[PDB]
Motif scaffolding. Structure first.
Motif, short mmCIF file in Angstrom:
data_model
loop_
_atom_site.label_atom_id
_atom_site.label_comp_id
_atom_site.label_asym_id
_atom_site.label_seq_id
_atom_site.Cartn_x
_atom_site.Cartn_y
_atom_site.Cartn_z
N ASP A 1 -4.01 -7.98 13.74
CA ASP A 1 -3.66 -8.26 12.35
C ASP A 1 -3.23 -6.97 11.65
N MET A 2 -2.25 -7.09 10.77
CA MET A 2 -1.61 -5.96 10.12
C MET A 2 -2.11 -5.85 8.68
N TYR A 3 -2.32 -4.62 8.21
CA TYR A 3 -2.82 -4.40 6.86
C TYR A 3 -2.21 -3.12 6.29
N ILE A 4 -2.31 -2.97 4.97
CA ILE A 4 -1.69 -1.84 4.27
C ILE A 4 -2.75 -1.05 3.51
N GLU A 5 -2.52 0.26 3.41
CA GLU A 5 -3.36 1.19 2.66
C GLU A 5 -2.47 2.04 1.76
N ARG A 6 -2.83 2.16 0.49
CA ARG A 6 -2.03 2.98 -0.42
C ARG A 6 -2.09 4.44 -0.01
N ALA A 7 -0.92 5.09 -0.02
CA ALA A 7 -0.80 6.48 0.39
C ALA A 7 -0.32 7.42 -0.72
N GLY A 8 0.25 6.90 -1.80
CA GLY A 8 0.59 7.76 -2.91
C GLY A 8 1.56 7.10 -3.87
N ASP A 9 1.86 7.84 -4.94
CA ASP A 9 2.89 7.44 -5.89
C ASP A 9 4.27 7.71 -5.32
N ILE A 10 5.26 6.98 -5.82
CA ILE A 10 6.65 7.25 -5.50
C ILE A 10 7.16 8.21 -6.57
N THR A 11 7.19 9.50 -6.24
CA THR A 11 7.56 10.54 -7.19
C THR A 11 8.34 11.63 -6.49
N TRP A 12 9.29 12.21 -7.22
CA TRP A 12 9.97 13.42 -6.79
C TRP A 12 9.05 14.62 -6.97
N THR B 1 -1.09 -4.87 -4.40
CA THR B 1 -0.27 -5.23 -5.55
C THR B 1 0.27 -4.01 -6.30
N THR B 2 -0.49 -2.92 -6.29
CA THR B 2 -0.16 -1.76 -7.12
C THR B 2 1.06 -1.01 -6.59
N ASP B 3 1.91 -0.55 -7.52
CA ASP B 3 3.08 0.23 -7.15
C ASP B 3 2.68 1.43 -6.30
N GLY B 4 3.52 1.77 -5.34
CA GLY B 4 3.33 3.00 -4.59
C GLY B 4 3.87 2.88 -3.18
N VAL B 5 3.65 3.94 -2.41
CA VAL B 5 4.00 3.97 -1.00
C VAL B 5 2.73 3.71 -0.19
N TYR B 6 2.86 2.92 0.88
CA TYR B 6 1.73 2.42 1.64
C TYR B 6 1.93 2.64 3.13
N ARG B 7 0.82 2.92 3.83
CA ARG B 7 0.78 2.83 5.28
C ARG B 7 0.71 1.37 5.72
N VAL B 21 7.06 0.21 0.67
CA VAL B 21 7.14 0.49 -0.76
C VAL B 21 6.74 -0.76 -1.51
N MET B 22 5.76 -0.63 -2.39
CA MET B 22 5.37 -1.67 -3.33
C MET B 22 6.02 -1.37 -4.67
N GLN B 23 6.85 -2.30 -5.15
CA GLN B 23 7.51 -2.13 -6.43
C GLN B 23 7.77 -3.51 -7.03
N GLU B 24 7.40 -3.68 -8.29
CA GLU B 24 7.64 -4.93 -9.02
C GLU B 24 7.00 -6.12 -8.32
N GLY B 25 5.84 -5.90 -7.72
CA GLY B 25 5.10 -6.96 -7.07
C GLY B 25 5.61 -7.36 -5.70
N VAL B 26 6.56 -6.62 -5.14
CA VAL B 26 7.17 -6.93 -3.86
C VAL B 26 6.94 -5.76 -2.92
N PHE B 27 6.55 -6.05 -1.68
CA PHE B 27 6.37 -5.03 -0.67
C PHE B 27 7.62 -4.98 0.21
N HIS B 28 8.14 -3.78 0.42
CA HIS B 28 9.39 -3.54 1.11
C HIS B 28 9.12 -2.69 2.34
N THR B 29 9.60 -3.12 3.50
CA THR B 29 9.50 -2.30 4.70
C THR B 29 10.64 -2.67 5.64
#
Lengths: 39, 149
Positions: A1-12, B1-7, B21-29
């Protein structure tokens, strides 16, 4: 099963390391989504 | 659900198979990362919504939301999330994939396979595409792969 973990903000980042070339390549994209070189 | 980059992780032990990428409630990969498999997020489930093998993209919970594009002149940043490493920004000037259907930005950066799906950013912080579908020239070059909104 596949899962996701937050890794950071999308920022320059202003202090970002800078590297890599900028090659110009002729390529083709096939139906399976694979890029290949063209000559 | 939260905006950001994810593993994107999979399970004897866990492995990082990609990034998204999570943006606007949608996960993109990228399609080749998940093949459209449902994704666990906490106690919730993210179900696929759209996918395309030729573009090598997939979205979850809703339609693809990213639509910024490389301006063809400016440096960009790969927001690389390699397995086992802190998210890090790598700045570069893209090269170009010249195709019969038009030109595509490309970055000559080579990170581990589990980095596939990492976002590429313009100076305003907008995602102009995802990293991890490309060609070899021993050096890997990734298209800046962007979907359609």
């Amino acid at each position: 099963d596949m899962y996701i973990e937050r890794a950071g903000d999308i920022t320059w980042e202003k202090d970002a390391e800078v590297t890599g070339n900028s090659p110009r390549l002729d390529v083709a994209l096939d139906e399976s989504g694979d890029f290949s070189l063209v000559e | 659900t939260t905006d950001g980059v994810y593993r994107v992780m999979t399970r004897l032990g866990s492995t990082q198979v990609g990034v998204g990428v999570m943006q606007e409630g949608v996960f993109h990969t990228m399609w080749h990362v998940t093949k459209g498999a449902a994704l666990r997020s906490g106690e919730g489930r993210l179900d696929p919504y759209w996918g395309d093998v030729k573009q090598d993209l997939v979205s979850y919970c809703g339609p693809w939301k990213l639509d910024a594009a490389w301006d063809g002149l400016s440096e960009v940043q790969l927001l690389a999330v390699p397995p086992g490493e802190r998210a890090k920004n790598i700045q570069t000037l893209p090269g170009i994939f010249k195709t019969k259907d038009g030109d595509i930005g490309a970055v000559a950066l080579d990170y581990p396979a589990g980095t596939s799906g990492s976002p590429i950013l313009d100076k305003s912080g907008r995602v102009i595409g995802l990293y991890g579908n490309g060609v070899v020239i021993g050096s890997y070059v990734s298209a800046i792969t962007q979907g359609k909104r």
